[PDB]
Write a protein that binds this DNA or RNA. Structure first.
Ligand code: ZN
Ligand code: ZN
Ligand code: ZN
Lengths: 97, 151, 94, 128, 150, 81, 93, 152
RNA sequence: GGAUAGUCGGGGGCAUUCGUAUUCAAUUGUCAGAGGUGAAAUUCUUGGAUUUAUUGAAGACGAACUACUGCGAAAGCAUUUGCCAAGGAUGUUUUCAUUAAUCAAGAACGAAAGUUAGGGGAUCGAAGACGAUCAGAUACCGUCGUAGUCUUAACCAUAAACUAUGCCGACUAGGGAUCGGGCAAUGUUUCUCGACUUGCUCGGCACCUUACGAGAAAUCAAAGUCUUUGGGUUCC
């Protein structure tokens, strides 16, 4: 029974896709079949901005930030709750929440 | 990057050992739904210096563009990289390290390349991401002595 | 276009001769306007042919390709070392 | 104009944290303190509390040496690894700021690979 | 469908319903014939010359005026090539691919393309042999394909 | 819909259709006559000409072969018939 | 007639020396005794001699080429010539 | 007794009315009647002899001198070559990579022949019998065959 | 089918340029732990461990841009540049005129792993080596590490080699995105053309709704036009 029309991943007009590695476990996962998530974080805590401003120079200069991308396999994404099992009708909703 | 060259009475002189943009800036510049053009070139200045310069640019959305695509064809990318090449030679030919850096602080390369490449694609945020030196002269003792010593 | 094309136009309506002895005869006569030299030619022969064509005011073209490729473009089963075109005919090779 | 600047290469990993204070050049390191000697259980080496203690001990050592201003350079494992700052980097940075030392030029120097060699796991990962 | 491809392109030319020369085009049906003969004396392709009369000379489809095709006109006048145009062009392409293959020994894609061209040239040769446009003994040669093209 | 005059399609509908998909297929090109900006001769050129046309009098390039219609550069007036 | 399935030129060796060794000798022997094109003449009249000497027959291009033991040119020599040419062209300017 | 071919090259004596015939180690691609050039100002062409300090990095050479004037020591067997790894202008010395993988520093005046020693891959072919081994070492020395020590 | 014009493509081969990452080597500043795990344990480290600074070497690999996007008959193809051969679509009042579809047999290509040798061997890693683990672990876990992963020349011939869906031809409903081409805009913009937007059309990758229609249903624009059963043709 074909659960998903995509068969679990988006791939059309192609025969092979270069695989990548997971993060929590580092499993072999296809590039499209993986789960891509964005975690844009700051270099300090929300409560550490005041301490940094008191103990910084350069006239309260803008604190930088870190952009990193995470690739999760199916099992790790489900376990880490970044991706969860949905109902049959709700599976088709590809729009992010 | 500043390499220490000479030491003279509890004071060490430095020379330009290269420049690069920070990782935060580079990651902020690179984004999805756009095309990035990267070009490099090994250039020889007036004196015996070899420098590999790296320049990265990004295509610019016009304004009223509706599609979130704004890509560029491979032929257009090659033409832009050719534009990147001819402008680098033009702006570094008759320039020493003094004049090369002097054009480097205000991004003269970027300002004078966006106009040239505007006939192919708008482009934006064209910056010299890195420059690496490879061949330094023999300690440049007399040249550094003449250049420095003020105050 | 290409020299191979232009040679293709001249073979239907044009005067050309093959080989080294014949091209020397055409150059000595003076009716040879164009000479073509294969890439893998003897350098002494190339210098002699260039000297002959310089004296006879004929054009010299040492185009890319060995004598096998030249002969194949010439329409022959054998190897051709040098072409002497005395009349292009209806083409614009000259 | 009475500020002298050093460099703190804060190593951050999920298993341990390192506080490495040098001058403006990475050479001639003033202090090199790991988080494994402020606690003795071999389990909370990367804990924020242990990073708090290690960084403040380094801060006291730097203060007695005579180096107050510190440029900050956080670096994770990098390469083929998690590539995320450890839990102790934030605590170490907070302790350096709290101990009376000026913090400048926060930067990340995590080594990025251009699709480097394979990583351990054997195409199935660290299956648990 | 494409003979040796998955494409389904339908690009072609739609000949007009009219079968007469334009009003101003007083081609007089003989100056064009002389122009065609001159264009064939050099040895240009019948398709290429027909393009030249369509673009530069401004001549309509040559049949509507001369009453005969380009191939038929030159055949009647005697300037008939030894081989058909499509046959000669395919042999040229096959020869070029084999010359590239003998140099580049690690091009399996080019070898596959050569095999497709060899299949196409053989089928066309078989049709021409059946139709009688060529001598019955016209066995295509791989070693003397250079002879056949030129 | 369910009642369409296929024998006599709309003129606008035929225009917004492929040259082959019409009721009767036909060319969409045209032959035009061009005069040199500084001469008096006439030349017949094709809309989708593949080769560069050279005027017999003192003139520049008559047209530039593009993918579709040939580019016209010089200041000439063309008549379509 | 085919006259032989596998051994080819090696068939002079009979049943001895081992099949794998016989096949390895067969490939190299074919290369050693194969004709090659003369880059200066074009004729396929280049024969091996003394494992490194290659001579062209005929009344022309009587030169002797210094090549490999079994082939006129090897991959290492071709790559070396290519990189030498690239270095020369990049050092002339 | 040598796998690689040898090249007899005739030069012109710069001081006397005479010609000198040399015995270069043949480089692959060399032909009789070819013009070879030896000196500091020679071109980077296969078969020419140049100082190691006058050549770029990564070039493949053969018959390389360990010291300037010993007339060739390194990379002389068939199919072997030496790669110029780098240079050092101050106290001019060139770092090279030997066929065995060793890295050697030589003065930047030692001469080397651009190219690879002719003879290709000779050891790829099995000797296939004692007769070929006998004939190979007959023109070399009395070292074949060999009796095992445990058999004595 | 063959030309011809502008193209287009992460299509193929050869040469060639760049990138940091990993490991290793020298030297330098320093000393107590470093690694690892859920917790450990093994191993190495006051002889200078880990970390950090300079230089060099090795091979592997092209992150971010990387997309329900592109190319190739499939397997597969992602750094720059140059050369060679080729390919589809589009435009065309270009040429021949049935030259076409399907394939038993017959042949080319054919992931990864496996084989023969040469070169090369950084990381990972079959086999294997140790230490917790449960009653037994012998397997998962941590470190090391063999064949292997790279390339050259010869082999084979299979996988969930998948769209679990043979190929060619015709017809069949509504929408919006998307790649390539072409046509039109007294529309915007740019130091003669390019970028953006809109409309039409052809050729692809697809998506949402609906089910006249099909099915045992899941579902399907084909798996529809089939008890109202027959367009042509291979495999099973
Ligand atoms: Zn995982
Ligand atoms: Zn004109
Ligand atoms: Zn010869």
């Amino acid at each position: 029974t074909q659960k998903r029309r995509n068969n679990g991943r988006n791939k059309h007009g192609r025969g092979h896709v270069k695989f990548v590695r997971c993060i929590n476990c580092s499993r072999a996962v296809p590039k499209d079949k993986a789960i891509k998530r964005w975690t844009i974080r700051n270099m300090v805590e929300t409560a550490a901005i005041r301490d940094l401003s008191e103990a910084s120079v350069y006239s309260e200069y803008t604190i930088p930030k870190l952009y990193i991308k995470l690739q999760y396999c199916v099992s790790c994404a489900i376990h880490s709750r970044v991706v969860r099992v949905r109902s049959r009708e709700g599976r088709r909703i590809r729009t992010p929440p | 990057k500043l390499r220490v060259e000479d030491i003279q009475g509890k004071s060490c002189l430095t020379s330009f050992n290269g420049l690069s943009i920070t990782s935060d800036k580079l990651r902020s510049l690179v984004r999805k739904w756009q095309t990035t053009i990267e070009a490099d070139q090994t250039i020889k200045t007036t004196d015996g210096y070899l420098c590999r310069v790296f320049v990265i640019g990004f295509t610019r959305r016009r304004a009223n563009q509706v599609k979130k695509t704004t890509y560029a064809q491979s032929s257009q990318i090659r033409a832009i990289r050719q534009k990147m090449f001819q402008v680098i030679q033009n702006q570094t030919s008759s320039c020493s390290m003094r004049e090369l850096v002097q054009k480097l602080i205000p991004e003269v390369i970027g300002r004078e390349i966006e106009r040239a490449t505007g006939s192919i694609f708008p482009l934006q945020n064209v910056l010299v991401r890195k420059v690496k030196i490879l061949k330094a002269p023999k300690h440049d003792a007399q040249k550094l002595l003449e250049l420095h010593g003020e105050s | 276009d290409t020299i191979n094309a232009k040679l293709a136009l001249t073979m239907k309506s044009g005067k050309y001769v093959l080989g080294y002895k014949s091209t020397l005869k055409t150059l000595r006569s003076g009716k040879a306007k164009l000479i073509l030299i294969a890439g893998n030619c003897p350098p002494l022969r190339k210098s002699e042919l260039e000297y002959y064509a310089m004296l006879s005011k004929a054009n010299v073209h040492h185009y890319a390709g060995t004598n096998i490729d030249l002969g194949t473009a010439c329409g022959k089963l054998f190897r051709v070392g040098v072409l002497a075109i005395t009349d292009a005919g209806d083409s614009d090779i000259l | 104009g009475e500020l002298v600047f050093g460099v703190a290469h804060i190593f951050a990993s999920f298993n341990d944290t390192f506080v490495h204070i040098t001058d403006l050049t990475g050479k001639e390191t003033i202090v090199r303190v790991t988080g494994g000697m402020k606690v003795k259980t071999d389990r909370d080496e990367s804990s924020p509390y242990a990073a708090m203690l290690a960084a403040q001990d380094a801060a006291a050592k730097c203060k007695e040496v005579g180096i107050t201003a510190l440029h900050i350079k956080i670096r994770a494992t990098g390469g083929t690894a998690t590539k995320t700052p450890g839990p102790g980097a934030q605590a170490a940075l907070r302790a350096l700021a709290r101990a009376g030392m000026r913090i400048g030029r926060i930067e990340d120097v995590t080594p990025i690979p251009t699709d480097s060699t394979r990583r351990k796991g054997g195409r199935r990962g660290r299956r648990l | 469908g494409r003979m040796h491809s998955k494409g389904k392109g339908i690009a072609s030319s739609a000949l007009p319903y009219v079968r007469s020369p334009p009003a101003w085009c007083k081609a007089d049906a003989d100056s064009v014939v002389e122009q065609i003969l001159k264009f064939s004396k050099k040895g240009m392709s019948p398709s290429q010359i027909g393009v030249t009369l369509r673009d530069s000379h401004g001549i309509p489809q040559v049949r509507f005026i001369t009453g005969q095709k380009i191939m038929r006109i030159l055949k009647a006048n005697g300037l008939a090539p030894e081989l058909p145009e499509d046959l000669y062009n395919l042999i040229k392409k096959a020869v070029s691919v084999r010359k590239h293959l003998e140099r580049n020994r690690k091009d399996k894609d080019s070898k596959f393309r050569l095999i497709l061209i060899e299949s196409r040239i053989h089928r066309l040769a078989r049709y021409y042999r059946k139709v009688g446009a060529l001598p019955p003994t016209w066995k295509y040669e791989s070693a003397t394909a250079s002879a056949l093209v030129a | 819909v369910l009642a369409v005059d296929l024998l006599n399609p709309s003129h606008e509908s035929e225009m917004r259709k492929h040259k082959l998909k019409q009721l009767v297929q036909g060319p969409r090109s045209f032959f035009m006559d061009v005069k040199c900006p500084g001469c008096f001769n006439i030349t017949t050129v094709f809309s989708h000409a593949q080769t560069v046309v050279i005027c017999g009098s003192c003139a520049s390039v008559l047209c530039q072969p593009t993918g579709g219609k040939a580019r016209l550069m010089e200041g000439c007036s063309f008549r379509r018939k | 007639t085919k006259r032989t399935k596998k051994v080819g030129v090696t068939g002079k060796y009979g049943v001895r020396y081992g099949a794998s060794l016989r096949r390895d000798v067969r490939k190299i022997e074919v290369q050693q005794h194969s004709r090659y094109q003369c880059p200066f003449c074009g004729r396929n009249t280049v024969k091996r001699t003394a494992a490194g000497i290659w001579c062209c027959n005929g009344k022309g291009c009587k030169k002797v080429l210094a090549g490999g033991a079994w082939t006129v040119t090897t991959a290492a020599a071709t790559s070396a010539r290519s990189t030498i040419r690239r270095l020369r062209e990049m050092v002339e300017v | 007794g040598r796998g690689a071919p040898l090249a007899k090259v005739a030069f012109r004596n710069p001081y006397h009315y005479r010609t000198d015939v040399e015995t270069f180690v043949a480089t692959e691609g060399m032909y009789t009647g070819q013009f070879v050039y030896c000196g500091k100002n020679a071109a980077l062409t296969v078969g020419n002899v140049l100082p190691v300090g006058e050549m770029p990095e990564g070039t493949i050479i053969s018959n390389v001198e360990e010291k300037a004037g010993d007339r060739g020591a390194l990379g002389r067997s068939s199919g072997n070559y030496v790669i110029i790894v780098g240079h050092d202008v101050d106290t001019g010395k060139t770092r090279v990579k030997l066929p065995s993988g060793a890295k050697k520093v030589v003065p930047s005046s030692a001469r080397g022949v651009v190219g690879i020693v002719a003879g290709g891959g000779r050891i790829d072919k099995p000797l296939l019998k004692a007769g070929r081994a006998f004939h190979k070492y007959r023109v070399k020395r009395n070292c074949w065959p060999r009796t095992r020590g445990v058999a004595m």
